[PDB]
Amino acid sequence: GSSGSSGPARFIEDVKNQEAREGATAVLQCELNSAAPVEWRKGSETLRDGDRYSLRQDGTKCELQIRGLAMADTGEYSCVCGQERTSAMLTVRALPIKFTESGPSSG
Fold this sequence. Notes:
Layout: E1 18-19, E2 25-31, E3 39-40, E4 53-55, E5 61-67, E6 75-77, E7 79-80, E8 88-91
Parallel strand pairs: 1-8
Antiparallel strand pairs: 2-5, 3-7, 4-5, 6-8
């Protein structure tokens, strides 16, 4: 009766910034006011569940994993579910190079 509306879903909870060292697996989770699908984007691009990407939803909550985090991957991801969408900067902290120092004790 009153305020009778239904259809599109809005992201009640915006994902949190993403941070993981190179060669890691990011995880973007969010929540919706109502059971609805989503489209995990990236640097202005649409992503899809596959080998590297893993999108999992549980009713109103969503999830997206990124296997193979690299310097390039470092970008901005947005989860769209209709008219609105979220965003969480993903920083890929390059792993500490295992550079082997050589010290023959000469100088």
